[PDB]
Design a protein around this ligand. Structure first.
Ligand code: BCB
Ligand code: BCB
Ligand code: BCB
Ligand SMILES: C/C=C1/c2cc3[nH]c4c(c3C)C(=O)[C@H](C(=O)OC)c4c3nc(cc4[nH]c(cc(n2)[C@@H]1C)c(C(C)=O)c4C)[C@@H](C)[C@@H]3CCC(=O)OC/C=C(/C)CCC[C@H](C)CCC[C@H](C)CCCC(C)C
Ligand SMILES: C/C=C1/c2cc3[nH]c4c(c3C)C(=O)[C@H](C(=O)OC)c4c3nc(cc4[nH]c(cc(n2)[C@@H]1C)c(C(C)=O)c4C)[C@@H](C)[C@@H]3CCC(=O)OC/C=C(\C)CCC[C@H](C)CCC[C@H](C)CCCC(C)C
Ligand SMILES: CC(C)=CCC/C(C)=C/CC/C(C)=C/CC/C(C)=C/CC/C(C)=C/CC/C(C)=C/CC/C(C)=C/CC1=C(C)C(=O)c2ccccc2C1=O
Ligand code: HEC
Ligand code: HEC
Ligand code: HEC
Ligand code: HEC
Ligand SMILES: CC(C)=CCC/C(C)=C/C=C/C(C)=C/C=C/C(C)=C/C=C\C=C(C)\C=C\C=C(/C)CC/C=C(/C)CCCC(C)C
Ligand SMILES: CCCCCCCCCCCC[N+](C)(C)[O-]
Ligand SMILES: CCCCCCCCCCCC[N+](C)(C)[O-]
Ligand SMILES: CCCCCCCCCCCC[N+](C)(C)[O-]
Ligand SMILES: [Fe+3]
Lengths: 323, 332, 258, 273
C-alpha cells in the first residue's frame, strides 16, 4: 500500500511562502504557526489571514445577525442561563406566525426575524465579494465566486424571494437548530410532498453525484499519487502518466473518460447544479404549483398501490357528518 | 440511549411502502400490565322492586334502575373514581341525597357525559365504549388532562420539578416540546385544535395549481398553520403510542381512499368527539369545581386523546364493560 | 382560475421541466464531453489511412483549441497532434483487435505497461518565482525534517526480497508545497544514486521497506541528467519504474492472484 | 479505438481469476472474468425486471414498481409475483455490484495504480446492504426493504422516515446530511479552485500551487493542500453513508420511538430538568 495517501510519513518545514496580491498585501495579519498532527493529514501551516474591508463588513453584519438571534433565543427561556444551554437546539427566532402579507411584521412576531435576515444577507454579500475580489487580486478565475453565488441565491430563495412571490413573510426559514429543521416538514407538507417536486429530484441527483464524483475523483488522485497526480495544474498543461492512467482506468471501466481539467468542470458543474435546481424548485413552489403530488398525478407520473387495509372514505364528505 | 431488539412490527400498507407499527415488547408489556388493573365487572344483580325514581329522593340520571342495580352502579363508580376515598367522596354520611359536596354534582354530569359518549360517538368508541375508569384510572383527578397552557408532567400523579411548574417561565419550551413528542414545534395543538372547533386542521391544497383568489398575500393562510397541524399530529401519534403510518400513507397526507387506513377515519371522529366533550361537558365545569382544580385562567381540566388512550392505540387494549353496565350507554 | 395555468392542459412548471432537461443535455453533451476530448484525441485505429480528408465525426467531437500561457514563458495548445514516437517493445498476443500486448524484452527498462512514462517536457518544474521546485536537502538548506518524524538519512533500504539494497542519503522536497516527494539512496555495490518516490516507501524507524521491486532491480532505475534537479519527464521515468515492478518484478505478479 | 497515449498501457496481466482467458478489451471496455460475471448478472437482472414489469399494471417508467413481499413471509422465499421477483432482482444487483467492484481492482492492477477507487466503491455497495439485507435481517422480514421503482422507492423513504415521527432528528441522519452538504461544497471549492488557476482568462498566465494555497489562506486562514483535498474529499463523501448507516440500522432494531424523543438523554438529565 502507498501509505502517503493515508498520512504524511515525514513532514517538511520551511520558510513561509507569500504570493503577492495586486492589493491588500499589508492586510494579511497574524503570524503563521505549524501543527504537527494537522500536518499528518494536511498542510501544517495555519495562518496568516487576509483581513480586507469586506471580510470585516461580513463579520460586522454577521455578528449583528447572530446577536439578534441569540438575544431572542435567551428571551425565550426568560434569560435563565442554565435552561439556555439545556434547551439550545429547541430555541429559535421565528418569522411572523400571523398573516400580515408583505406588511412589515411586529417585532414580537417576526420583526426581529426579518432584521436578522437582512443582516445575514448583508454578511453573505460582503463575504461574496471577498471570495471574488481575492481571486482577482491573486490573478485567478472567478469560478469559486460563481459557485458561491448560486449557494447565496438559493438561501435568498428560501429566505425571502419565495415569501415575496407568494406575498407572506410567514414562509421564511426560522433561525435555530431544530426550528430550521421543522420548517422543512412544514414546507413540504404545505406544498404536497417535496418528493414529487422534480427540481427536488434534480437537486438530489446532483447532490448524490457530488458524492459519487468526489469519492471517485479523490480516490483516483490518491491511486495516482505515486506519479504526482496531485500536482494537477502541471498535469493539465503537460499530461503525465498519472492522468494518462487515471483516464485509462475510467475509460476501461465505463467506456469513456475525462481530462484532468474537465473532471473539475464536471464536479464544479454538479455542485453548481445542486443549488440552481433547488432554486428553480422553490421559485416554482407556491407561485405556480400548490401541491406537488397532485401535479404529478395531473401529469400521470405518480405511482399507485392497491389497498392493504380497506380504502377509507373521507368521513367529512359523508352525508350529515359534523364539521 | 437505545432500546434492545427485537422489535415487533406490523403492516398497514401495501408491501414495499414501509408502513406499519414498530413497537418495543418491554414497553407494550408495561402498558398492558398497567391497563390490566381495570377492575372486573361486578356480579350481575336481578332487577327487583320499583325503579329508584320512586324510592330514593335525588336521582335524576339513573332513575330507570332498580335498587340493587343502582347500588351496583354506585360501587362500580366508587371503584373506578374514588376507590381510596370511598362513598363519602361524593356523599354526606347521613344524607345520601345531599348535593353539598362538589364531586356529587360533577359525577352527575360525568354520568350524562359518558352516557353521551357511548350513544352519540359510537363512530369512535364502537362496541368497546368507555366507563369512568377509562379516564380516571381509580383516582378522582384523571392522570392525563390538559389546561389552556401546557403542563408537566403529563401524568399529574408525578411531582413537578421547579422548571416543570407552569409558573416557571424558563421551562415553557420544554413543557411544550413534551406535548409534541419532543419536537421544537412552537404551537400548542390542544388549545388550537382540541379545546374547540374554531380551527381547521387541514392545510394542504386539493388542486395541483394555486387557485387565483386564495393564493397571494393576506388571502393565504400562514405557513404556521402547517407547523401547527404537524404539531397536533406529532401529539396524536405520541398519545396513542404509534406513528404517522398508522393512519397515513405519507405519499399524500391529504388523501383518503387507498391513501388512508380505517384508523384515520376513526381518529377523525375522535377529534370531533373530544371537541364535543370539552366544549359541552368538561369546560363548563369551572363553575362547579374548587379553585385548586382550575388552571391559571379559571379553566377546568379538559380531555385530549391521551386522557383515554394513555399511549395505546385502543384504550386499555380494547377492554370493555359495555354489556356489563347497560346504564352507561348506549341509551335508546 | 389558476396561477401557472396555460392553454389546453399546459402549465408553467411542465414547460420548465422540459427546459431543464434540455439545458442539462446541452451542457453535458455539447460542452463537457467535448472538454473531455482535449487529450488523447483524435483516436487511433489499425492505421486510419484516409490521409487526404478527415472523417466527419473526428471534427465534430473536438472543441475549439485553447491556449495556456505558461507562467515561466511558453504556451501549450490543446488538443494537438501528439503521437507516441518511441519504439514500444511490445508484441500482439493475438489478431483480435482488443487483445493485450506482451513485452518483448525487459519491461522495466523498456518502459511499457505499468512501467510506461508519459512524454512530458524535459524541463524542471519551477517554483512561483523561478527556482527548481523539486530539490534535495543538500540544496534546500532552509528546509528541515519536522520535529518528531524519522530522519531517513542513514537508514537502509530493504527491497522486496529482504535484501539491503542501499542507504538513504537524502530527501528531495517540493519547495512549492513543503512536501517530501522522493528519497535519494546509494545503490549498494554499484556506486550510483537513485530516487524513490515516497509512495513506494514504508518509512520505519530503523529501515525503509520497499516492496515494489527486488534488490537487484535498483540497478536500472532511470538516471537523472543532473545531480541536484529533476525534469518532469524524469519524474515520470522514475515513478513509472517502480510501478512497473508491481506487475513485473517477479513472474508470479502478472498471473492471477488465485 | 485507442487514445493516442493508450497503446503502451494495454498489456496482459493483473487479473484476479482466469489469467489470459478473459484478459482482453471489447471496444474501450476491459472485460476480465468480472466483466463476464457483471454482464451475466446485469442480463439476468434486467430480464427479471422486464418479466416482472409486464405482469404489472402499467408500462410508464415512473409508475413501475417491483416490491418486496409482505412481512408475513419473514425471511423465506415469496411467490414470484408477490415478492419473489424482488428477491431474485436483489441477488442479481449484488452480483452485478460486487462484480463491477472486482472488475475495477483488475483494471487497477494492470495500470499499476492504487485500488482506492474500488475501495471507495465498497461504501455504496455496503450502504445498499444496510438497507436491503442487514436491516431486514435484524427486523426479521425482507418486507422491510425498499421497492425498485423510480418514484415508488421515494414513497418508501418517505414512510420509513415518518415511522419515527421526524427523521430529521435522527443523529445518524444529522451526521450523514452534514457530510452530504459539506462534500458538495468542497467539490465546488476544489473544482472551482483548479479551474480558477488554469483559466484566469484574458490571456493572463496560468498560476501555480503557491497561488492555490495562497488563495485559501487569504480567505479562510488555512489551505489543506493539493494531495490532502483529495484525501479529504474521499473521506467526506464516504462518511455520508458510513455514518448514515448507523442511523438507518438503529431505526427499528435499536429504537422504536420517535427520533426527537431520543434527545431525552440530554433534555431530561435531572441536574437541569
Ligand atoms: C435511503 C434512501 C435512498 C434513496 C433516496 C432518494 C431520493 C430522496 C431521491 C432519489 C433519487 C434517485 N434515486 Mg434513489 N436510488 C437509486 C436511483 C435513483 C435515481 C432514480 C434518482 C437519481 C439518482 C442519482 O442521480 O444519483 C447520482 C448518480 C448519478 C448522477 C449517475 C447517474 C445515475 C443514473 C441517473 C441512475 C438511473 C438508474 C436507473 C433509473 C435504474 C436502473 C435501471 C436498470 C433497468 C438498468 C438506485 C439505483 C438506488 C439503489 C440501487 O440503492 C437508490 C437508493 C436510494 N434512493 C435509497 C432507497 N433517491 C431522486 C429521484 O429523482 O428519484 C425519482 C430523488 O429525489
Ligand atoms: C419531509 C421534508 C423533506 C425535505 C424538505 C426539503 C425542502 C423544503 C427543500 C429541500 C431541498 C433539498 N433537499 Mg430535501 N431531501 C434531500 C436533499 C435535498 C437537497 C439536495 C436539496 C437542496 C438543499 C441543500 O442542499 O441545502 C444545503 C445548502 C444550503 C442551505 C446553502 C447554504 C449556503 C450559505 C451561503 C451558507 C452560509 C451560512 C453562513 C456561513 C452562516 C451564517 C448564519 C448565521 C449568521 C445565522 C434528500 C437526499 C432527501 C431524502 C433521502 O429523503 C430529502 C427529503 C426531504 N426534503 C423530505 C421530502 N428539502 C431544497 C430543494 O432542493 O427544494 C427543491 C429545499 O428547498
Ligand atoms: C420523510 C423522510 C425523510 C428522510 C428519510 C431517510 C431514510 C429512511 C434514510 C435516509 C437516508 C439519507 N438521507 Mg434522508 N435526507 C437527506 C439526506 C439523506 C442522505 C444523505 C442519507 C443517505 C441516502 C442513502 O442512503 O442512499 C442510498 C444509496 C445507495 C444505496 C446507492 C447504491 C448505488 C449502487 C451500489 C449502484 C447502483 C448502480 C445502478 C443500478 C447502475 C445503473 C447506472 C447506469 C448509468 C448504467 C437530506 C439532505 C434531507 C433534507 C434536506 O431534508 C433528508 C430528509 C429526509 N430523509 C426526510 C426527513 N433518509 C439514509 C440514511 O443514511 O439515514 C441515516 C436512510 O436510510
Ligand atoms: C452545492 C453548493 C454548496 C456550497 C458552496 C459554497 N459554499 C461556500 C463557497 C461555495 C462555492 C465559498 O467560497 C464560501 C467559502 O468561503 O468557503 C471557503 C462558502 C461558505 N460556505 C459556508 C458554509 C456553508 N455552506 C453550505 C452549503 C453549500 N455551500 C452548498 C452545499 C452550508 C450548509 C449545507 O448549510 C454551510 C453552513 C461558509 C464556510 C462560507 C461562507 C462564510 C460567510 O458567508 O460569512 C458569514 C460571517 C460570519 C461572521 C460567520 C462566521 C462563522 C462561519 C462558520 C465562517 C468562519 C470562517 C472564518 C474565516 C474562520 C477563521 C478561522 C481561522 C483563523 C483558522
Ligand atoms: C459515498 C459513496 C458514493 C458513491 C461512490 C461510488 N459510486 C461508484 C464508484 C464510487 C467510488 C464507482 O467506481 C462506480 C463507477 O463506475 O462510476 C462511474 C460507481 C457507480 N455508481 C453508480 C450509481 C450510483 N452511485 C450512487 C451513490 C454513491 N456512490 C454515493 C454517493 C447512487 C445513488 C442512488 O446515490 C447511484 C444510482 C453507477 C453509475 C456506478 C456503478 C455501476 C455498476 O454498478 O455497474 C454494474 C450494474 C449495472 C450496469 C446495472 C445492474 C442492474 C441490476 C442487475 C438490476 C437493477 C436493480 C436495481 C437495484 C434497481 C433499482 C431501481 C431504482 C429505481 C431504485
Ligand atoms: C456488451 C458486452 C458483453 C461488453 C463486455 C465488456 C463489459 C463488461 C462492458 C460493460 C458494459 C457496461 C455495463 C457499461 C455501463 C458503463 C457505466 C456503468 C456507465 C455509467 C457512467 C456514469 C453515469 C457515471 C457517473 C459519473 C460521471 C458523471 C462521470 C463523468 C466524468 C467522468 C468520466 C469521470 C471519471 C473520471 C474521474 C472520476 C477522475 O478523477 C479522472 C481523473 C483524470 C482523468 C480522467 C478521470 C475520469 O475520467
Ligand atoms: C361520585 C363519583 C360518587 C361516589 C363515589 C358514590 N356516589 Fe352515590 N351518587 C352519586 C351521584 C351523582 C348520585 C345522584 C345520581 C343521579 O342519578 O342523579 C348518587 C346517588 C346515590 C344514592 C341515591 C340516594 C338519593 O339521592 O336519594 C345512593 C343510595 C347512593 N348514591 C349510594 C352510594 C354508595 C353506597 C356509594 C359507595 C358504594 C356511593 N353512592 C358512591 C355520586 C357518587
Ligand atoms: C374522560 C372522557 C372522562 C370520563 C369518561 C369520566 N370522567 Fe370524570 N372527569 C374527567 C375530567 C377531565 C375531569 C376534570 C378533572 C377533575 O378532577 O375535575 C373529571 C372530574 C370528575 C370528578 C370531580 C373530581 C374532583 O375534581 O375532585 C368526578 C367526581 C368525576 N369526574 C366522576 C366521574 C364518573 C363517576 C364518571 C363515570 C360515570 C366519570 N367521571 C367519567 C374525565 C372523565
Ligand atoms: C391517526 C390516529 C393519525 C395519526 C397517527 C396521524 N394522523 Fe395525520 N391526520 C389524521 C386525521 C384524522 C386527519 C384529518 C383531520 C381532520 O380534522 O380533517 C389528519 C390530517 C393530517 C394532515 C393534513 C392533511 C390535509 O388534508 O390537510 C397532515 C399533514 C397530517 N395529518 C400529517 C401527519 C403526520 C406527519 C403524522 C405522523 C407525525 C400523522 N399525521 C399522524 C390522523 C392521523
Ligand atoms: C375516551 C372518551 C376517548 C378519547 C378522548 C379518544 N378516544 Fe380514541 N378510542 C376510544 C375507544 C373506547 C376506542 C375503542 C377501541 C376499539 O376497539 O375500537 C377508541 C379507538 C380509537 C382508534 C382505533 C384504533 C384501532 O386500532 O382501530 C383510533 C385511531 C383512535 N381511537 C384515535 C383517537 C384520537 C386521535 C383521539 C384524540 C382526537 C382519540 N382517539 C380520543 C376512546 C377515546
Ligand atoms: C425589505 C427588508 C426589510 C426585508 C428583506 C430582508 C431580507 C433580505 C431577509 C432575508 C432573510 C433570509 C435570507 C433568511 C434565511 C434564513 C435561513 C436560511 C436560516 C437557516 C438556518 C439558521 C440557523 C441554522 C441558525 C441557527 C442559529 C444559531 C445556531 C444561533 C447563532 C449562533 C451561531 C454560532 C450560528 C452557527 C451556525 C452553524 C455554523 C452552527
Ligand atoms: C422526483 C419527481 C419526478 C417526477 C417526474 C414527473 C414529470 C412530469 C412531467 C411529464 C411530462 C409531461 N407529460 C405530457 C408527459 O405528462
Ligand atoms: C438526475 C441528474 C442528472 C445527471 C446527468 C449526468 C449524466 C451523465 C451522462 C454521461 C453520458 C456519457 N456519454 C458518453 C454517453 O456522453
Ligand atoms: C433519460 C435519463 C438518463 C439518465 C442518465 C443515464 C446515464 C447514461 C450512461 C449510459 C452511457 C453508457 N455509455 C454508452 C457511455 O457507455
Ligand atoms: Fe482534483
Amino acid at each position: 500500500a502507498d501509505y502517503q495517501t493515508i498520512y504524511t510519513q515525514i513532514q517538511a518545514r520551511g520558510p513561509h511562502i507569500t504570493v503577492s496580491g495586486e492589493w491588500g498585501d499589508n492586510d494579511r495579519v497574524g503570524k503563521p504557526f505549524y501543527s504537527y498532527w494537522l500536518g499528518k493529514i494536511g498542510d501544517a501551516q495555519i495562518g496568516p489571514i487576509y483581513l480586507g474591508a469586506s471580510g470585516i463588513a461580513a463579520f460586522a453584519f454577521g455578528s449583528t445577525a447572530i446577536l439578534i438571534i441569540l438575544f431572542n433565543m435567551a428571551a425565550e427561556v426568560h434569560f435563565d442561563p442554565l435552561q439556555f444551554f439545556r434547551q439550545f437546539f429547541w430555541l429559535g427566532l421565528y418569522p411572523p406566525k400571523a398573516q400580515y402579507g408583505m406588511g412589515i411584521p411586529p417585532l414580537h412576531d417576526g420583526g426581529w426575524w426579518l432584521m436578522a435576515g437582512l443582516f445575514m444577507t448583508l454578511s453573505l454579500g460582503s463575504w461574496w465579494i471577498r471570495v471574488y475580489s481575492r481571486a482577482r487580486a491573486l490573478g485567478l478565475g472567478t469560478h469559486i465566486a460563481w459557485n458561491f453565488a448560486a449557494a447565496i441565491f438559493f438561501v435568498l430563495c428560501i429566505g425571502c424571494i419565495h415569501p415575496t412571490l407568494v406575498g407572506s413573510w410567514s414562509e421564511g426559514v426560522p433561525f435555530g437548530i431544530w426550528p430550521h429543521i421543522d420548517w422543512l416538514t412544514a414546507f413540504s407538507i404545505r406544498y404536497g410532498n417535496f418528493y414529487y417536486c422534480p427540481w427536488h429530484g434534480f437537486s438530489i441527483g446532483f447532490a448524490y453525484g457530488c458524492g459519487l464524483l468526489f469519492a471517485a475523483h479523490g480516490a483516483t488522485i490518491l491511486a495516482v499519487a505515486r506519479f504526482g497526480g496531485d500536482r494537477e495544474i502541471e498535469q493539465i498543461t503537460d499530461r503525465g502518466t498519472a492522468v494518462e492512467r487515471a483516464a485509462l482506468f475510467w475509460r476501461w471501466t465505463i467506456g469513456f473518460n475525462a481530462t484532468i481539467e474537465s473532471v473539475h468542470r464536471w464536479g464544479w458543474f454538479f455542485s453548481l447544479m445542486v443549488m440552481v435546481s433547488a432554486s428553480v424548485g422553490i421559485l416554482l413552489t407556491g407561485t405556480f404549483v400548490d401541491n406537488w403530488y397532485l401535479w404529478c398525478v395531473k401529469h400521470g407520473a405518480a405511482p399507485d398501490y392497491p389497498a392493504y387495509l380497506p380504502a377509507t372514505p373521507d368521513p367529512a364528505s359523508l352525508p350529515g357528518a359534523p364539521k | 440511549c437505545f432500546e434492545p431488539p427485537p422489535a415487533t412490527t406490523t403492516q398497514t400498507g401495501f408491501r414495499g411502502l414501509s408502513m406499519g407499527e414498530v413497537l418495543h415488547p418491554a414497553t407494550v408489556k408495561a402498558k398492558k400490565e398497567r391497563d390490566a388493573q381495570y377492575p372486573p365487572a361486578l356480579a350481575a344483580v336481578k332487577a327487583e322492586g320499583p325503579p329508584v325514581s320512586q324510592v330514593y329522593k335525588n336521582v335524576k340520571v339513573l332513575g330507570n334502575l332498580t335498587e340493587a342495580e343502582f347500588l351496583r352502579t354506585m360501587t362500580a363508580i366508587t371503584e373506578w373514581v374514588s376507590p381510596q376515598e370511598g362513598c363519602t367522596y361524593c356523599h354526606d354520611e347521613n344524607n345520601l341525597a345531599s348535593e353539598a359536596k362538589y364531586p356529587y354534582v360533577v359525577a352527575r354530569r360525568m354520568l350524562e357525559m359518558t352516557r353521551a359518549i357511548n350513544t352519540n360517538w359510537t363512530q369512535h368508541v364502537a362496541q368497546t365504549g368507555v366507563t369512568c375508569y377509562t379516564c380516571h384510572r381509580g383516582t378522582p383527578l384523571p392522570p392525563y388532562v390538559r389546561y389552556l397552557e401546557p403542563t408537566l408532567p403529563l401524568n399529574n400523579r408525578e411531582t413537578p420539578t421547579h422548571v416543570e411548574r407552569v409558573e416557571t417561565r424558563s421551562g415553557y419550551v420544554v413543557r411544550l416540546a413534551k406535548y409534541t413528542a419532543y419536537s421544537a414545534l412552537n404551537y400548542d395543538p390542544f388549545t388550537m385544535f382540541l379545546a374547540n372547533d374554531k380551527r381547521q386542521v387541514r392545510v394542504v391544497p386539493q388542486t395541483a395549481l394555486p387557485l387565483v383568489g386564495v393564493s397571494r398575500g393576506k388571502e393565504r393562510r400562514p405557513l404556521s398553520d402547517a407547523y401547527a397541524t404537524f404539531a397536533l399530529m406529532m401529539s396524536i401519534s405520541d398519545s396513542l403510542g404509534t406513528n404517522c403510518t398508522f393512519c397515513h400513507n405519507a405519499q399524500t397526507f391529504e388523501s383518503w381512499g387507498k391513501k388512508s387506513t380505517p384508523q384515520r377515519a376513526i381518529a377523525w371522529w375522535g377529534i370531533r368527539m373530544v371537541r364535543d366533550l370539552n366544549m359541552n361537558y368538561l369546560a363548563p365545569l369551572n363553575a362547579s369545581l374548587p379553585a385548586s382544580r382550575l388552571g391559571r385562567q379559571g379553566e377546568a381540566p379538559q380531555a385530549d386523546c391521551r386522557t383515554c388512550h394513555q399511549g395505546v392505540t385502543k384504550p386499555l387494549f380494547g377492554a370493555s364493560r359495555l354489556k356489563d353496565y347497560p346504564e352507561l350507554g348506549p341509551i335508546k | 382560475m389558476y396561477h401557472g395555468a396555460l392553454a389546453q392542459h399546459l402549465d408553467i412548471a411542465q414547460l420548465v421541466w422540459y427546459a431543464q432537461w434540455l439545458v442539462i443535455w446541452t451542457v453535458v453533451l455539447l460542452y463537457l464531453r467535448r472538454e473531455d476530448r482535449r487529450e488523447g484525441y483524435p483516436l487511433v485505429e489499425p492505421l486510419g489511412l484516409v490521409k487526404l480528408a478527415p472523417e466527419d465525426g473526428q471534427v465534430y467531437e473536438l472543441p475549439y483549441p485553447k491556449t495556456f500561457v505558461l507562467p515561466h514563458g511558453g504556451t501549450v495548445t490543446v488538443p494537438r497532434r501528439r503521437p507516441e514516437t518511441r519504439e514500444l517493445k511490445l508484441a500482439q498476443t493475438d489478431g483480435f483487435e482488443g487483445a493485450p500486448l506482451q513485452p518483448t524484452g525487459n519491461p522495466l527498462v523498456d518502459a511499457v505497461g505499468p512501467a510506461s512514462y508519459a512524454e512530458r517536457a524535459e524541463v524542471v518544474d519551477a517554483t512561483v518565482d523561478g527556482k527548481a521546485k523539486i530539490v534535495p536537502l543538500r540544496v534546500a538548506t532552509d528546509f528541515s525534517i519536522a520535529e518528531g518524524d524519522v530522519d531517513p538519512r542513514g537508514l537502509p533500504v530493504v527491497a522486496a526480497d529482504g535484501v539491503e539494497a542501499g542507504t538513504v542519503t537524502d530527501l528531495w522536497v517540493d519547495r512549492s508545497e513543503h512536501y517530501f516527494r522522493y528519497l535519494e539512496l546509494s545503490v549498494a555495490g554499484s556506486a550510483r544514486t537513485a530516487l524513490i518516490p515516497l509512495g513506494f516507501c514504508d518509512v520505519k524507524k530503523d529501515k525503509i521497506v520497499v516492496t515494489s521491486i527486488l534488490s537487484e532491480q535498483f540497478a536500472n532505475v532511470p538516471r537523472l541528467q543532473s545531480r541536484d534537479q529533476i525534469t518532469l519527464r524524469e519524474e515520470d521515468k522514475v515513478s513509472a519504474y517502480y510501478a512497473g515492478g508491481l506487475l513485473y518484478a517477479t513472474p508470479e505478479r502478472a498471473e492471477s492472484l488465485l | 479505438a485507442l487514445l493516442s497515449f493508450e497503446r503502451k498501457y494495454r498489456v496482459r496481466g493483473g487479473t484476479l481469476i482466469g489469467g489470459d482467458l478473459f484478459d482482453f478489451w471489447v471496444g474501450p471496455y476491459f472485460v476480465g472474468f468480472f466483466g463476464v460475471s457483471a454482464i451475466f448478472f446485469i442480463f439476468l437482472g434486467v430480464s427479471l425486471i422486464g418479466y416482472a414489469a409486464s405482469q404489472g399494471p402499467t408500462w410508464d417508467p415512473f409508475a413501475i414498481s417491483i416490491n418486496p413481499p409482505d412481512l408475513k413471509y419473514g425471511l423465506g422465499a415469496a411467490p414470484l409475483l408477490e415478492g419473489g421477483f424482488w428477491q431474485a432482482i436483489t441477488v442479481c444487483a449484488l452480483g452485478a455490484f460486487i462484480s463491477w467492484m472486482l472488475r475495477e481492482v483488475e483494471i487497477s492492477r494492470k495500470l499499476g495504480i492504487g485500488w482506492h477507487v474500488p475501495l471507495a466503491f465498497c461504501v455504496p455497495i455496503f450502504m445498499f446492504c444496510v438497507l436491503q439485507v442487514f436491516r431486514p435481517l435484524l427486523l426479521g422480514s425482507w418486507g422491510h426493504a425498499f421497492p425498485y421503482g423510480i418514484l415508488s422507492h421515494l414513497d418508501w423513504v418517505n414512510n420509513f422516515g415518518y415511522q419515527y415521527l421526524n427523521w430529521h432528528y435522527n443523529p445518524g441522519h444529522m451526521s450523514s446530511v452534514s457530510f452530504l452538504f459539506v462534500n458538495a461544497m468542497a467539490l465546488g471549492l476544489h473544482g472551482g479552485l483548479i479551474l480558477s488557476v488554469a483559466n484566469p482568462g484574458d490571456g493572463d498566465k496560468v498560476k501555480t500551487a503557491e497561488h492555490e494555497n495562497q488563495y485559501f489562506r487569504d480567505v479562510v486562514g488555512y489551505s489543506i493542500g493539493a494531495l490532502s483535498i483529495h484525501r479529504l474529499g474521499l473521506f467526506l463523501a464516504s462518511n455520508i453513508f458510513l455514518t448514515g448507516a448507523f442511523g438507518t440500522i438503529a431505526s427499528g432494531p435499536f429504537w422504536t420511538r420517535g427520533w426527537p424523543e431520543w434527545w431525552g438523554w440530554w433534555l431530561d438529565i435531572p441536574f437541569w430538568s
